[PDB]
């Protein structure tokens, strides 16, 4: 087609729709447990996606697991932004077809604040008019956007993969942004959106880990696979003991 | 010839606290950490009582007092470990308590030799500097007052007055021994740098502690009541850097 084959591949490997299983009165705590229930199902889906993503299975298995444990929440908030942009024009948060939040369902002050943070992504998607082909290549680069302070075991292959998906994003931008000046500026805008996600996700990581270490008292359930990625890396990530990659100074 | 506020600090200094540790039984990774945290809980209770006696502290807002103890406990307790090790065993063993003393061979046998080396840095620095009791008592008050919230304190004006008063007192304590002008100025720089350096050493202890707390059931490590409360109140936020560490340099 005019659509490059790697992008059409990324489109075919996107996860199908995941339901939260929410029991449809609204309450902050039961809402949070439903959000983490959904997060467990989405985590399964991200690891399956990774198994089909070109290049990723060839990195050392420890690097595969480290990059999923670093990037899971960033990938899931970026997909929440896509669904919300696409289904409700960014104006509600479309966590799943059975768990769509508007402002009436955001009652407790810290819950609404966290939603506003997440709401930044679909607002930028609406402003910039991000395309599916852009979003698919961006989402790979977010998987690949933090490494350990000592680097990865397959650092060479990693660097090759990340360059390949930067070239692919350039192709995605080229589908629509025809000028030299305009497609350069578009590359800048998209890559700076990805750099800015590191600071957005830090607030969600802190709230997550604070809730997780008193989850019993809070009556907030975290499922087993999500509890493992939290316990394995979150405190180290929050402490700054990882290397976030940036496109811009 | 000792200034009255320092004599007061000496008078209110906690007494030595026993761990009640059973040195019949060989060290086990779980039993050694559980006994360390039981002793830490008793030392934390004592720091709370000390703070009720420390001039100025009871006149800050009660939420400020709680926050400053939640931010500084680890720093206070490591600094107190350093002083007892220097005073009682010439700095050459870690003197957690009179019944819980780790010489280097017991450190090496423990599963925690690296952590023990990191904490044993502090008494070795006290030996190198020949820190006096009057300098230590003032430095320890400044560790209580060495981090504030990003938004400041409710009693920010009273806090600054208090913290400046204890800086002035450290300057008087230096003057007891350092009679020359340049020597005295250099010693103020050295001791205040020692304090600034402790932020980085304590970050390492805070990360291990929070990982141990998350994994406490798996690892059979007990965390007593007040210790748990302060870890769950602030430790993720401190490790995220969402507080303001005060530096002298
Ligand atoms: C602030 C965090 C960040 C949250 C994730 C964002 C990314 C995300 C997107 C999804 O579509 C489904 C689940 C997750 C993976 C989230 Cl909503 C949940 O697990 C729920 C998460 C972890 C989190 O969400 C909230 O606290 C929250 C979300 C909305 C309002 O409060 C939380 O700590 C639950 Cl206790
Ligand atoms: C690495 C940390 C730092 C430790 C504190 C240092 C400061 C301290 C000084 C004490 O005398 C009593 C207790 C504490 C408060 C410590 Cl030893 C314990 O709670 C035990 C603490 C938190 C800690 O200690 C160790 O892990 C450890 C290994 C060997 C010595 O300490 C821990 O995480 C245990 Cl869960």
Report whether A217 contacts B229 (CB < 8 A).
Answer: no
Closest by CA to A141, choosing from A5, A10, A1, A2, is A10
B69 lines ligand 2 (CB under 6 A): no
The phi-psi region of residue A146 (left if phi > 0; otherwise alpha if psi is between -120 and 50; otherwise beta) is beta
C-beta separation of B245 from B147 below 8 A: yes
Q: Rounded to whole angstroms, how far apart are CA atoms A172 and A136?
A: 9
Resolution for this model in angstroms, one decimal place?
Answer: 1.5
B17 lines ligand 2 (CB under 6 A): no
- Helix, strand counts (H, E) of chain A: 9, 4
Q: Which of B203, B213, B215 is nearest residue A239 as measured by Cβ atoms?
A: B203
Q: How far is CA B242 from the centre of its chain?
A: 20
DSSP assignment, residue A147?
E
- E strands within B88-235? 94-97, 100-102, 147-148
> Using a CB-CB distance cutoff of 8 angstroms, which residues of chain A are in contact with residue B203?
239
Paired with A148 in beta bridges are A242
B236/A231 CB distance under 8 A: no
Label each residue of A151-191 as H, E or C: CCCCHHHHHHHHHHHHHHHHHHHHCCCCCHHHHHHHHHHHH
Distance, in Å, from the CA atom of B137 to the CA atom of B194, rounded to the nearest integer, reads 14
Give me the helices (H) in B54-155, please: 62-89, 104-109, 113-119, 121-129, 133-144
- CA of A181: how far to CAs of A128, A149, A186, in Å? 16, 35, 9
Judge if the beta carbon of residue A77 lies within 6 A of ligand 1: yes
User: Domain residues of chain B, as ranges?
Assistant: 1-249
What does the alpha-carbon distance between residue B188 and residue B248 come to, in Å, rounded to a whole number?
A: 10
CA distance B215 to chain A (A): 8
Residue among B166, B190, B194, B185 nearest B3 (CA): B166
Q: If you measure from the C-alpha of residue B228 to the centroid of ligand 2, how many angstroms do you get, rounded to a whole number?
A: 13
Q: Report A:211-240 residues touching B (Cβ under 8 A).
A: 212-214, 231, 235-236, 238-240
CA of B35 to the centre of ligand 2 (A): 9
Q: Is A60 exposed, middle or buried (0-12, 13-18, 19+ CB in 10 A)?
A: middle
Among B158, B35, B45, smallest CA distance to B96 is for B35
- A vs B, Cβ pairs < 8 A, gives 37
**Residues of chain B neighbouring A238 (CB-CB closer than 8 A):** 236, 239-240
Do residues A73 and A198 touch, judged by C-beta distance below 8 A?
Answer: no
Q: Please state how this structure was obtained.
A: X-ray
User: Which 8-state DSSP code applies to residue A93?
Assistant: E
Q: Do A236 and B207 touch (CB under 8 A)?
A: yes
A1-249: which CATH architecture?
Orthogonal Bundle (1.10)
In a mutational test of the A interface, the residue from B214, B227, B245 whose CB has the highest number of chain A CBs within 10 Å is B214
Q: Nearest chain A Cα to B203, which residue?
A: A239
Q: Which of B18, B29, B34, B36 to mutate to test the pocket of ligand 2 (most atoms within 8 A of CB)?
A: B36
- Within 10 A of A244 (CB to CB), how many other CB atoms are there? 16
CA-nearest residue of chain B to A201? B240
């Amino acid at each position: 087609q005019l659509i490059p084959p790697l992008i059409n591949l990324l489109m075919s490997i996107e996860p199908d729709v995941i339901y939260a299983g929410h029991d449809n009165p609204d309450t902050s705590s039961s809402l949070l447990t439903s959000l983490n229930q959904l997060g467990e199902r989405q985590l399964l889906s991200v690891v399956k996606w990774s198994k089909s993503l070109p290049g990723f299975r060839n990195l050392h298995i420890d690097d595969q697991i480290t990059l999923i444990q670093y990037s899971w929440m960033s990938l899931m908030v970026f997909g929440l932004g896509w669904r919300s942009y696409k289904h409700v024009s960014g104006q509600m948060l479309y966590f799943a077809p059975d768990l769509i939040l508007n402002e009436q369902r955001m009652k407790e002050s810290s819950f609404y604040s966290l939603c506003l943070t997440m709401w930044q992504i679909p607002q930028e998607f609406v402003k910039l008019q991000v395309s599916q082909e852009e979003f698919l290549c961006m989402k790979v680069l977010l998987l690949l956007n933090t490494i350990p302070l000592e680097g990865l075991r397959s650092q060479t292959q990693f660097e090759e993969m990340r360059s390949s998906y930067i070239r692919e994003l350039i192709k995605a931008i080229g589908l629509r942004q025809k000028g030299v000046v305009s497609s350069s500026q578009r590359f800048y805008q998209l890559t700076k959106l990805l750099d800015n996600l590191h600071d957005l996700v830090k607030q969600l990581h802190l709230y997550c880990l604070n809730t997780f270490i008193q989850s019993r008292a809070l009556s907030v359930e975290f499922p087993e696979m999500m509890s493992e990625v939290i316990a394995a890396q979150l405190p180290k990530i929050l402490a700054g003991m990882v290397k976030p990659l940036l496109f811009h100074k």
